[PDB]
Every structure is written in C-alpha cells, then in structure tokens.
Amino acid sequence: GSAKDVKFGADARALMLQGVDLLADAVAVTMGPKGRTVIIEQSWGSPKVTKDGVTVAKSIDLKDKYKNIGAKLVQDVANNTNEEAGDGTTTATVLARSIAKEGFEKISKGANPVEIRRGVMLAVDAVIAELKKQSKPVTTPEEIAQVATISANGDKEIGNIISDAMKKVGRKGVITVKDGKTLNDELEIIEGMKFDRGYISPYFINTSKGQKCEFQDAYVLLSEKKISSIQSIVPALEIANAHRKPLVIIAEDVDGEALSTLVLNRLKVGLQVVAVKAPGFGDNRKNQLKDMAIATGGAVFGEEGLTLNLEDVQPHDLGKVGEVIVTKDDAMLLKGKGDKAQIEKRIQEIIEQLDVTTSEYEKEKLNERLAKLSDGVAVLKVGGTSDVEVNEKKDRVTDALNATRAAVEEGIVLGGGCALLRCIPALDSLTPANEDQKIGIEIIKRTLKIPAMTIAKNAGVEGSLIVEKIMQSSSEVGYDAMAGDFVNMVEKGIIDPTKVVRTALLDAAGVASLLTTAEVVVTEIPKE
Amino acid sequence: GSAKDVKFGADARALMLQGVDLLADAVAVTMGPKGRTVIIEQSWGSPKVTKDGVTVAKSIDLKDKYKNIGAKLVQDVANNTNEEAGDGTTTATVLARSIAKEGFEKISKGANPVEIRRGVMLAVDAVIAELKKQSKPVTTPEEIAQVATISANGDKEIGNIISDAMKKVGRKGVITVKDGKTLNDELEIIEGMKFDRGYISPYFINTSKGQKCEFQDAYVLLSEKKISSIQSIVPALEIANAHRKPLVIIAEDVDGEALSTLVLNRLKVGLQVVAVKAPGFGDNRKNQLKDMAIATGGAVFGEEGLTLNLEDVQPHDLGKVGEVIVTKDDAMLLKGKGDKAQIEKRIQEIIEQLDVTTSEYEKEKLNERLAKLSDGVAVLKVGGTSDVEVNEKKDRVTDALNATRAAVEEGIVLGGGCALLRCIPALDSLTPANEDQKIGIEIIKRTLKIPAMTIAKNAGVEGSLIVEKIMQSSSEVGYDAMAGDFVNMVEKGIIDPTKVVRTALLDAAGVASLLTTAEVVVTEIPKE
Amino acid sequence: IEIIKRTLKIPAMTIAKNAGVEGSLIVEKIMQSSSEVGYDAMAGDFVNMVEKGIIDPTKVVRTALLDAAGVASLLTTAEVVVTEIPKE
Ligand SMILES: Nc1ncnc2c1ncn2[C@@H]1O[C@H](COP(=O)(O)OP(=O)(O)O)[C@@H](O)[C@H]1O
Ligand SMILES: Nc1ncnc2c1ncn2[C@@H]1O[C@H](COP(=O)(O)OP(=O)(O)O)[C@@H](O)[C@H]1O
Ligand SMILES: [Mg+2]
Ligand SMILES: [Mg+2]
C-alpha cells in the first residue's frame, strides 16, 4: 500500500487536540451577539464572509495529518448538527472541543476510556431527558417571531418577515429564500396554483397591458400527451365557442397544427383561448395535472389506464376556473370550482404519501403539491447591495427559518446557554456504576457550562463569573449579552429550539467521547 | 481538501487593510481634474492607459492571500458601482477604503462590530435621504451639456457632442459610441428605418453613383419565409408593373429562381425592383418585419396564423414608402405611409413590453425598435490617432454618456464632494441607540469628507483646509480644482447625478462595514 | 524663502498631530486668530498663552531653527554621493 506513520499515546493526543483547538478557536468567535464574522477565501471569486459554524468548519483543512484528523472529527460534528437540525453548529463545535479537551486529561495508565465514554453517554441521555422536561411548546405567533429574531443574529426585520410568512402560509407551509435584487427584504406569497410556464404563441395576449392573457370564468382542458392534429382539438373549442367562454389548454405540448388552428381562430373571429405546457419533467407532471384537474374539476385526457380521449369531450368534462393569468414565463389559476370535498381527499392522500416515504426530493415536490393546493407558498427575497452581503444575510435567514421550523414541532427552552446550565442538577443525582462512569459524568458536568461561558467571553466580560451568577439566580433569570445584564428570558424574549440544543449536545458528545478513546494514530506520510 | 491557513484578529486586519490601501492608492490618483492616468500592461498587445476606477481596480490582483482578499473586497465595491450607475467608481473605492480604515481602529475587545455596521447603515440611509432632499431635476439642455462636460474629464467637446445627440434623439434615445477612424469626433444620426443589410444581386443599381439603388414612392413586399419560386413572386411584380412604381422585396431570402426572374426583368425591360433579406437574425426578425410593415402599411407574408399567402396579394396589401436607399451593406426606408395612429399603438405595445421584463439583451433590441421606429439612433464615432488614445477617449465618452443618462432620470446635485459635505448636518441629528451605532455614525461622518479631500490633494493643495473652508462657506459655494478657487456651482457649472453619488456611497458603506466585522481569515496555502 | 515659509508651520502641525487632531486645520485657525491666542494641546483648545502659561526661550527656538536650516539647506545642494563599499 502506501507508506504510513504511527504515533502512540500522548503525542498523537496532543496533535489531535491542537487541531481541534485550532478549528474550534476559528469558529468559537462567531457565537452569540457580539460574535464576529470569518472571511473565507474563495478559490475563484470574491470571498465568503460567514458567521455559521460549518462554512468556517468545512473550510478549515490543516496541513499536518494529525491536526487534520482532529479537524475532520470536528467537521463531522458540525456537519451532523447542520444536517439534523439546521442550526446548532457553533455550540456543537464548542461542546465537542470541551469534551475532547476534558477527555485528553483523565487518560492515565489506569483509566478506561471506553467506560469514560459510557459514562459520558449516560450523562448525555440524562441531560437530554431533562431538556424535554423543562421544554414547552410554541403556541403564540409572537414566540415564532422571537425565535426568528434571535436566530437571525438579533435582526428583528428577519423575525417579523418570517412570522408574517408563517401566518399567511401555515406553520408547516413552504417558505423559501432567494437572492433578492432590491435593497430591502420582500415577502412574496404565491397564491393559488401557479407553475413556471407561460403561453406558447405570443398572439393570445388580450390585455393591452404587461404582456398577459387574462381570463375570467374559463374552461380548462388538461391533456397528458400532445395535442397534435386539428381533429382532437376541434371538439373542445366547439364546446367553448358554443358556451361562449374562454379556454385554457394545459397539455404536454400543442403541435404546430393545433397551434395554428388556435392562433388562427384567435386573430380572426376571436374564440378566447390560450395554451400552455406541463409543469414537470416526466412523472411529476403526471400527478400535477391530475391535481390541477381535481382542483378545477375535470379529467386529464390521455391517461395510461383510463381510456379518455380528446375526441369525446363534454362541458362537464372540462375544468372550471374563476380567474386565469398567463404571462410569458408563468401561468396562474386562482379559483377552481373543483368540489373541495374531493380535493380534501386528495390532500389526505398526499399527506399520507409524504408520511410513508422520504427521499429529500420526492418529499420536496410532495410538500410543493401540498402548499400549491392548500395555502400558497412564501418566498423571501433577501435585500442587499453586493453578492457577499446577500449571501451572508441569506445564510442568516435560512438559519432563522430552520430554527422557526424546528421550534414549532419540538418546543422551546431558555436561551443563552441557560437551557444546559439548568440541567446540572440532573447530573447531580446520577449514581455512576464505577469510577470511569463517574469521570464521564463529571466531564459532561463541566462541559455543560461552555456555551454561556463562550457567549460572555465574546461579549467582553468574564465568562465564568457570569455563569456562576446565573446558576445562583432563579430559574427564569439569565444573561442578555447585548443589553449586558440579567433579565427574565421569556419576558425579554430569548428562547431556542429544544431540538437544536439536544442535537448539538448529542452529536458533540458522541463524536468527542469516541475521539477521546484513541491510543494510536496512523497517518499517510506526505510524499509531496 | 486543500491545506489552509487561518489568521486571527489584528494580524489579519492589518494585512487586509494593507491590500485595501494598495488597491485604493492605485486608483485614488485618478480622481477629479489634475488626476492622472494609469498604464495597465496587457498580456498580448499595447497596454491600456486608463483613468477609470474599475480597470485600475479589476486589474490589480495581489500575490499575498490576505492583501488579495482586501483587493477583492474593494473590486466588488468598484464593480457594483459600475454596474449599478456606470460612474462613481473611484469615489466608491475611496469611500470604501475610508470606511475600512476607520473600521479597523474602533475594534477593541469590548466594541461590537455588528452594531457598528448597523450604525453605519443608519447613517448611510440618513445621508442618502438627504441627497434626495437637496437634489433637483435636470430640465434645461445646458445642464445636460454641463454634466457631460464634467464627467468627460472636463472635455467640453464631448459635452457639446452628447448634448446635441440628446437633443436630436431624445433624452431616452439610443446613443452608442464606436471606435472612429478620423481625427475628430462625429455625431451620426441614423434616421428613419435602417438595417445593416444590402441588396442581394448587384444588378439593381440604377444610380450611376456610389453603388446605390434609390427609389421614390416605392412599394414594399414583406415576406417572413423565403420567396423560392417564380409563382409566388410573379403577382407582386404584376401589381407593381401595372401601377408603374418601384418595388422593394424584404424577405428572409430570395431563392435563385425568383432572383433570376427579378434580375431578368431588371436588365431587359428595366423594371424598378430591389431585394433584401430580413434584418433580424432569429426570432427578432419576426417582430421587426411586422414593425416595418405597420410603419409602411401592409402585411408580412408567410405569418403562422395570419396566413396571407404571397399568391393572393393586392395593391392595398403592399407597403408604401416615400424614399428607399439600398447599398451593398445596409438598407434605409425613410417615409412610410403607415397610419401613424397604429404605429403609436405599436410604440405603446413595445414600451409596455420593456416595462414588463428585463434581460439586458431583450430590452436592448426592444429599445432599438423604439428608437428605429420613433426618432432614429445617434452614434458617436470617437476620433484619436492610435488605439490607446481611442480607447481612453471612448471610455471617457461612455462615462459621460452614462452620467448624462443617470442625471435625466434622477436629478442633479452639487459637485466636487460638496454633495456629501452638505449632508453632515443630517448626521448631526441622529440619536444612536447605543455606543456602537454612535461609533458607526461617527465613522460615516468622518468618511463624508474623503472625496473633497482627495480632490484637493490631487490638485496639489491642502485637502483638509479646503474642506474646512468649504464647510464654513454658504450652501452653493465650493471648490473648483481646475481654476483652483471658490465659486458658485450651478452658476459655474459643476453638478453630478444624485444616482451616482448615492450608489457609490451605499455600495462602499455596505461592503466596507461588512469587511470591518471580521475576526478570522482563512486562506489556501500558496503552494506553487 | 518659500521653503522657509512652508517649514515654519511644521512644529505646531506636529504637535497637533501627536495630540490626535488635524494639524493643518489647527495651524490655520491659529494664524487666523489674534497675536496672543494659540493652541493648548493638553486641554485641547484655544487660549491666551502668557495668561495660561505657555512660553519658551527665544534662544532655544532661534538655535533650533538656525541649526536645522543651516544643515538642511546644505544637504539639499548635493548632486553626487560617495559611499564606501559594504564589503563584510
Ligand atoms: N441576546 C442574547 N442573549 C443571550 N444569548 C443569546 C442572545 N442572542 C442569541 N443568544 C444565544 O446564541 C446562540 C445563537 O447564536 P449562535 O451563537 O450563532 O449559535 P448557533 O451557531 O447554533 O447558530 C444561542 O445560544 C442563543 O440562545
Ligand atoms: N472642476 C471640478 N472641480 C471640482 N470637482 C470636480 C471638478 N470636475 C469634476 N469634479 C468631481 O470629480 C468627480 C468626477 O470625476 P472623478 O474624480 O473621476 O469621479 P469618478 O471616478 O466617479 O468618475 C466628481 O466628484 C466631480 O464632482
Ligand atoms: Mg443559530
Ligand atoms: Mg465620472
């Protein structure tokens, strides 16, 4: 194989701890208010200016192999916390460094690091079982705004924007962030059924306005496969002209022959029609056209095992929509007379379909179909002047959004580190089975103080003194590091998701208590 | 990944500030009259000789990684200002260096850089809200000449040329600058409907002059697709010969058969005809031929839905034009009897079509159609003797043109830096919420003096003394650095667009106040 | 004469500079003021001098000016410089 190099004991431990200390000192400055950004050189363009604890962690890679091992084992913690909770990365990294440092001190010749790991895991379980006891659900719409404000680095505009977007879409709706172009932030609630696809021929525009085809009380002809010939298209247009109502033709495509017939009828005698293609690549459109049909009320033509053809249509076989807008890039149906008692059955079908499976993309478009059929979708356009500002503010907005979505499902708990400091009395009743589990419980009991200490440190005050005066205080009092004083929390409005706190703690403890059990380190020699 | 290197605190700040200072000292010499060019080595040919603050900024790239980070964060400022306003790059870069320098001095252990950023942004908002109050619209045609003269580095010929081009085309017309060939500048006003495409066969020339086909009161046959056979071409020529008038044949192309028929009828019986291909290369031609038709009055043949076959034409189906000139590379129709009441509807259609969308190329050809259909288009052929002279003078002309186009939409304000010096009393009423926002407001209050100071510095006098004696003076008095004395501004004729001033200030403040919040810098190893 | 007229402003400028303020602005506002008014860089404001108690010997001022001007105006007259090689 490749020439390798082994290091034993305290040397390898010291190098791994140096790497962890470097990668955790680079990120620990970002914590809390008064924390500070980190400029990462991008290999091609302008650099990133971050405050998150994964970009700062996923970027830092060390030259030395052992320091690099430490850096990788901390990046694993940061990335696991990011994926599992969306937030809690800096806290996870500082907890990991604390458990690693406290781990490479009790490893004597008689100490059993595996039993120390077992004690650490008992302590982590006993503390995440206390977080769930001191937690409380988020009910009022002010708590959502508060969580969004806090997780947005104290940006109250972000909090109000996210709270508004969650009031008009639902606490489990579909909010999404985009690179805005204006100077401020904007909340755009796409309402009704909208798909990113416009009319085919630019002759259907009857608006004398901003390039729109606008219909009221229109019919809908939903075709799965192409409408090629003049034969298939004529009966639907006959029905439309006889009833004297506009017609939208949502199909896979309108061939040049039927297209020519439609445009011809438009420019002369003036049947009111407009045509558009399907929303989704192959399979998604198959379900999405059916959703549109049952939302407006009708039948998709050309289905595989249904045997419905265009040649035999009827006025009760076409969908009915109150208002239709078709621009050059997107079509919006608004008021579908689609027998709500059945669209509700469809909604139950799709919610069960999400509850069954998960692929991070099937569930994505699945939730898209929920929101596109029940209550809109919100989009947050982040204001900014350059790309680096927009990227930083968009990262903060996505973090606040992940936090607000992690609070509504698993409750809130006190913030500023107090959620963990208020769990030390839980560890003070554990009876360790032996000396090693006692050592692990003590490691966790020390590590639970790291977050409040690091926040007070970044605030420019003495951390340990603040943590002590907090633990001496009541249960609802703690430290506001912006005002810099002791306040009630829920009255003042500092809270955090229990999910993010518990996932950060658990991931940090898990990776660090396994790093601390090492005795030999094997690294490939660097050739050049 | 790649082996990286992290630097913390004052070291990283010092290196990034060195990079910013280098990239801003290279560009600060270019400011104002008495400012000086910069010779940039081109990798392939003769070097550039610039005075703009983006070529000098986009060129400079530093060896060291941290200096390079500073240089990139200043290039972003210059480039954003260039894209958003077309001018204001040197000012934006000097403001960015001032804000960065004033930012890397107040960062003590207790100072909160994010609150300093917030205070800086409040100050920038309060000052751009004062620029808009002390502004005033540009109304007389002498203010346009003045703005063009000033932004052209005080070249009055450029100002008069741009003012003339804007009087004969409209303040929102289509002016464009080209590399001239003569020694002087030239204003060429392409009038009527002209497209860069000449006759097909060199037998239609009936001029006995400079290779031109010249018709008076001619018919126009507009065909979307090719005219292949003699069958389709014969009836139009029958109508033309019967009425005894010339005929122009604007089609996608003239096949060899109809072409041979045309050339034969031209050479043997001397029938007056001339043929040309369509102007638009692709989809654009389908709209441009329709525009030409409605401008002259007729129907484009071969349209998809408006079938209108060539075989059934009539004398009212052909366009009519007063004068036609067709050379070997361009055709010009001049006086189209096109029922102006309908071409006005077309103009409204195309103006709404620009108001709807934006792609930097669809809007480009869109405005091209507006100008080519309403009041022609002006071109500015810049003189010069070598390519480097022509390039420098062309850059100055494009900057003067961008300035004049940014002044006519958002008003003018005093110049020489006085626009910003007259905004400090606005900052003198801000009540900062805390100490950090107060620090930010003070940073902006110091930064607002940088432009007048740098101009007086380049003029060879004491900057700060000039700025002080300006602030002591009245509201309309300021410093003329060419005459070198204090004068009224609008009376003497120094003004700048409020858009360029506000965009430069806002972009500089935005990028600099985010650079100043950094605590750690991560850069890839320079390996080789 | 113009070189000396520019050089006479250097001391007040350097004092205002070390005090953390703008030197040239202070020198200008001093030259605009009366003959007994000047700048106190500790209190940082304009005061009468003998009333406030700032004075210097004319001997030290004149000797400093004369020695500086003398050596500098001879340094500025050079055209060639000859230096021993730095061998090792
Ligand atoms: N005013 C505040 N006072 C005390 N703690 C705060 C305050 N604002 C935010 N925090 C705490 O800082 C953390 C949120 O920001 P941050 O330090 O970046 O953590 P993360 O890396 O997980 O996003 C939470 O622990 C939060 O409770
Ligand atoms: N005679 C003048 N006197 C004072 N300021 C002037 C004069 N001419 C131009 N300026 C100022 O110089 C700037 C225009 O040229 P320049 O310094 O290169 O700025 P930019 O890089 O944005 O083009 C403006 O601030 C303008 O007000
Ligand atoms: Mg967070
Ligand atoms: Mg300019």
SS3 sequence of B434-456:
CHHHHHHHHHHHHHCCHHHHHHH
Are the beta carbons of A479 and A448 closer than 8 angstroms?
A: no
Are the beta carbons of B502 and B131 closer than 8 angstroms?
A: yes
Could you tell me the residue ranges of all domains in chain B? 1-136+412-528, 137-191+374-411, 192-373
Place of tokens 């361009």: B330
Are the beta carbons of A322 and A216 closer than 8 angstroms?
A: yes
A451: enclosing H helix or E strand:
helix A450-458
B109–chain C nearest CA distance, Å: 21
Q: Is B493 in the pocket of ligand 2 (CB under 6 A)?
A: no
Using a CB-CB distance cutoff of 8 angstroms, which residues of chain B are in contact with residue A43? 524
Q: Would you state the structure tokens that stand for residue B173, as one six-digit string?
A: 């017309």
Q: Would you state the structure tokens that stand for residue C34, as one six-digit string?
A: 């009366």
Q: Choose which residue among A155, A420, A494, A503 to substitute to test ligand 1 binding: the one with the highest number of ligand atoms within 8 A of its C-beta.
A: A494
- Report the C-alpha gap between B480 and B478 in whole angstroms: 7
Partner C, chain B 445-474, Cβ-Cβ below 8 Å: 462, 464-465, 468
Burial of B258 (0-12, 13-18, 19+ CB in 10 A): buried
- Report the C-alpha gap between B249 and B435 in whole angstroms: 76
Are the beta carbons of B87 and B507 closer than 8 angstroms?
A: no
Q: Would you state the structure tokens that stand for residue A527, as one six-digit string?
A: 């050739």
CATH class of A137-191+374-411: alpha beta
Q: Which of A478, A476, A483, A474 is nearest to A466 (CA)?
A: A478
Give resolution, Å, one decimal: 3.1
Q: How many CA atoms lie within 13 A of A287 on its CB side?
A: 16
Sign of CA dihedral A118, A119, A125, A131: negative
Residues B267, B268, B272: CA angle, nearest 5 degrees:
55
- Report the C-alpha gap between B446 and B467 in whole angstroms: 12
Rg (CA), chain B: 30
Place of tokens 């501004």: B489
- A2 touching B (Cβ < 8 Å): no
Q: Is A198 in the pocket of ligand 1 (CB under 6 A)?
A: no
Q: Is B496 in the pocket of ligand 2 (CB under 6 A)?
A: yes
Q: Which of B306, B251, B308, B302 is nearest to B274 (CA)?
A: B251
- The partner residues of A275 in beta bridges, in order of sequence, read A249
Cβ-Cβ contacts under 8 Å for A240 (sequence gap 6 or more): A219, A246, A247, A271, A272, A273, A318
Task: Look at residue B284 and give its three-state secondary structure.
Answer: helix
B324: enclosing H helix or E strand:
strand B319-326
Give the DSSP per-residue string, A21-70. Answer: HHHHHHHHTT-STT--EEEE--SSSSPEEE-STTHHHHH---SSHHHHHH
Q: Which of A191, A294, A275, A287 is nearest to A233 (CA)?
A: A275
Burial of B484 (0-12, 13-18, 19+ CB in 10 A): middle
Identity at A445, one-letter amino acid code: K
Q: Torsion angle, CA of A363/A188/B357/B92, rounded to 10 degrees?
A: -110
Task: Look at residue A5 and give its three-state secondary structure.
Answer: strand
Burial profile B297-314: b = 16 or more Cβ within 10 angstroms, e = fewer: bbbbbbbbbbebebeebe
Burial of B158 (0-12, 13-18, 19+ CB in 10 A): buried
Experimental method: cryo-EM
- C36 touching B (Cβ < 8 Å): no
- Report the C-alpha gap between A300 and A317 in whole angstroms: 9
Q: Which of B518, B275, B227 is nearest to A38 (CA)?
A: B518
**SS (HEC) of A453-466:** HHHHHHCCCCHHHH
Are the beta carbons of B266 and B273 closer than 8 angstroms?
A: yes
Q: Torsion angle, CA of B373/B374/B380/B381, rounded to 10 degrees?
A: 40
- Report the C-alpha gap between A397 and A177 in whole angstroms: 8
What are the Cα distances from residue A258, in Å, to A241, A263, B220? 16, 9, 32
Nearest residue of chain C to residue B461 (CA atoms):
C24
Q: Torsion angle, CA of B164/B169/B174/B178, rounded to 10 degrees?
A: -40
Which DSSP symbol is given to B209?
A: S
Place of tokens 């790497």: A19
Burial profile A85-119: b = 16 or more Cβ within 10 angstroms, e = fewer: bbbbbbbbbbbbbbbbbbbbeebeeeebbebbbbb
Strands of the sheet with A37-40, listed across from one edge: A48-50, A37-40, B518-524, B4-8
Nearest residue of chain B to residue A260 (CA atoms):
B305
Q: Do A26 and B521 touch (CB under 8 A)?
A: no
Are the beta carbons of B195 and B279 closer than 8 angstroms?
A: yes
A89 annotated to bind ligand: yes
Identity at A398, one-letter amino acid code: T
Which DSSP symbol is given to B136?
A: B
Alpha carbon A362 to chain centroid, angstroms? 15
Q: Which of B300, B303, B294 is nearest to A263 (CA)?
A: B303
Identity at B324, one-letter amino acid code: V
Q: How many CA atoms lie within 13 A of A470 on its CB side?
A: 34
In terms of phi and psi (left: phi > 0; alpha: psi -120 to 50; beta: otherwise), the region of A327 is beta
Partner B, chain A 75-114, Cβ-Cβ below 8 Å: none
Are the beta carbons of B89 and B52 closer than 8 angstroms?
A: yes
Q: Which of A212, A166, A210 is nearest to A189 (CA)?
A: A166
CATH code for the structural domain at A1-136+412-528: 1.10.560.10
Q: How far apart are the first and last CA of chain B?
A: 16
Q: Which of B35, B42, B30, B46 is nearest to B388 (CA)?
A: B46
Q: Which of B453, B457, B462, B466 to mutate to test the interface with C (most CBs of C within 10 A)?
A: B462
Q: Which of A236, A237, A173, A151 is nearest to A501 (CA)?
A: A151
Q: Where are the extended beta strands (E) located within B111-212?
A: 175-179, 186-190, 193-195
- Report the C-alpha gap between B178 and B394 in whole angstroms: 8
Q: How many CA atoms lie within 13 A of B58 on its CB side?
A: 14
Nearest residue of chain C to residue B469 (CA atoms):
C25
Q: How many residues does chain A have?
A: 528
- The partner residues of A212 in beta bridges, in order of sequence, read none
**SS (HEC) of B374-432:** HCCEEEEEECCCCHHHHHHHHHHHHHHHHHHHHHCCCCEEECCCHHHHCCHHHHCCCCC
Packing angle, helices B362-374 and B283-296, rounded to 10? 20
Are the beta carbons of B436 and B117 closer than 8 angstroms?
A: no
Q: Torsion angle, CA of B234/B236/B242/B243, rounded to 10 degrees?
A: -160
- Report the C-alpha gap between A127 and A124 in whole angstroms: 5
Q: Would you state the structure tokens that stand for residue B34, as one six-digit string?
A: 């008495």
- Report the C-alpha gap between A70 and A12 in whole angstroms: 10
What are the Cα distances from residue A488, in Å, to A31, A492, B414, B508, C50? 21, 6, 52, 40, 60
- Report the C-alpha gap between A294 and A337 in whole angstroms: 9
Give the DSSP per-residue string, A275-305. Answer: EE--SSSSSHHHHHHHHHHHHH----BT-TT
Partner B, chain A 341-370, Cβ-Cβ below 8 Å: none
Burial profile B60-77: b = 16 or more Cβ within 10 angstroms, e = fewer: bebeebbbbbbbbbbbbb
Q: How many CA atoms lie within 13 A of B500 on its CB side?
A: 29
Using a CB-CB distance cutoff of 8 angstroms, which residues of chain A are in contact with residue B506? 183, 385
Are the beta carbons of A413 and A134 closer than 8 angstroms?
A: yes
Are the beta carbons of A273 and A237 closer than 8 angstroms?
A: yes
C11: enclosing H helix or E strand:
helix C10-18
Query: Is the fold of B1-136+412-528 the same as that of B137-191+374-411?
Result: no
B98–chain C nearest CA distance, Å: 16
